[PDB]
Design a protein around this ligand. Structure first.
Ligand code: NA
Lengths: 143, 143
C-alpha cells in the first residue's frame, strides 16, 4: 500500500524499508550513483527527489542523509539541514564534516553561539586539516 | 530508532509540489494521458519532458517512473533506464516487470552476469507467466 504506512511500520520496527523489502544493494547503489551525479552537476531540484527517496528507503544510511542535508543547506533550508547533519553525526561520530556544516547552518540561523560551539568541536576533534582550517577561519570571522 | 523519526520528521517539515494541492487531479491525469500518447506515437522528446515533470511532481508514482524508464530504454540510455527501473522496483508491490527490464538493460550494457541475476530473480519470484517465459528465454540465450 502507501509509502507513508510503510514508513510508519519501518520506524516502529526500527528497520529500513530497504531491508524490509530486501531491495538488492546493487540497485540502491545505482540510484545513489545517479543521485550523486545530479548533485555534482549542480542539478539540485532533480538531486533532491532522488536523495529524499534514498533517505526514505534507508534512513540509517549516512551517505544518503549527508547528501540530502547538503541539498537542504544549498536551498537555504538551514534548520532541516542542521537536523539531518545531527543524525549523520550521531550515526558516524568519527566524522566532523556534519558538525562543521551544522556550524555553518547555525550561523545562517543567527545563532552565532551554537555555531562557535560546532566550529570548536571540529578544531578540537577532527583529523581533517582542511575542515579545521575552514572552522578556524569561521571562528576568526565571528570573533 | 528515535533516529529514524528524526530523519522522517526533518524530511516532512518541507512542503512539496504535491503537498500544496495547487494542481487539479484531472489536469494531472490529462498531462499523464498526453505524455503516454506522445510516447506510443513515437514523439519521444516531448514524452520525455512531460514524464520527467511527472516524476518530479510525484516521484513515488510507479507509472511516472516506469514511463520515464521506458523512454530511456527506447533511447538506449540503458544505465539511466536501469536506475529508474530500480526505483520502480523499490516502489512496487512484488512487481518484477522493472527487474526484467533491468535485465535487458544490463545485457545491453555488456553485464551478462547482472542480466542473468535479474532474469533469475524474475523466474524465482514473479507470478506473471508471460514475464517468466521471456525471462527464461533470455537466461537460455545467455547460458
Ligand atoms: Na555544502
Amino acid at each position: 500500500e502507501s509509502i507513508s504506512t510503510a514508513v510508519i511500520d519501518a520506524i516502529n520496527s526500527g528497520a529500513t524499508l530497504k531491508d524490509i523489502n530486501a531491495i538488492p544493494d546493487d540497485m540502491m547503489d545505482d540510484i545513489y550513483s545517479y543521485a550523486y551525479d545530479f548533485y555534482n552537476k549542480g542539478r539540485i531540484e532533480e538531486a533532491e527527489v532522488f536523495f529524499r527517496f534514498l533517505c526514505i528507503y534507508d534512513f540509517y544510511n549516512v551517505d544518503y542523509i549527508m547528501g540530502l542535508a547538503a541539498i537542504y543547506q544549498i536551498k537555504e533550508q538551514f534548520q532541516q539541514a542542521a537536523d539531518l547533519y545531527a543524525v549523520a553525526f550521531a550515526l558516524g561520530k568519527n566524522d566532523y564534516t556534519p558538525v562543521f556544516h551544522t556550524g555553518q547552518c547555525q550561523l545562517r540561523l543567527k545563532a552565532p553561539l551554537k555555531a562557535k560551539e560546532c566550529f570548536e568541536l571540529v578544531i578540537q576533534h577532527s583529523n581533517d586539516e582542511k575542515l579545521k582550517i575552514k572552522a578556524q577561519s569561521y571562528l576568526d570571522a565571528i570573533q
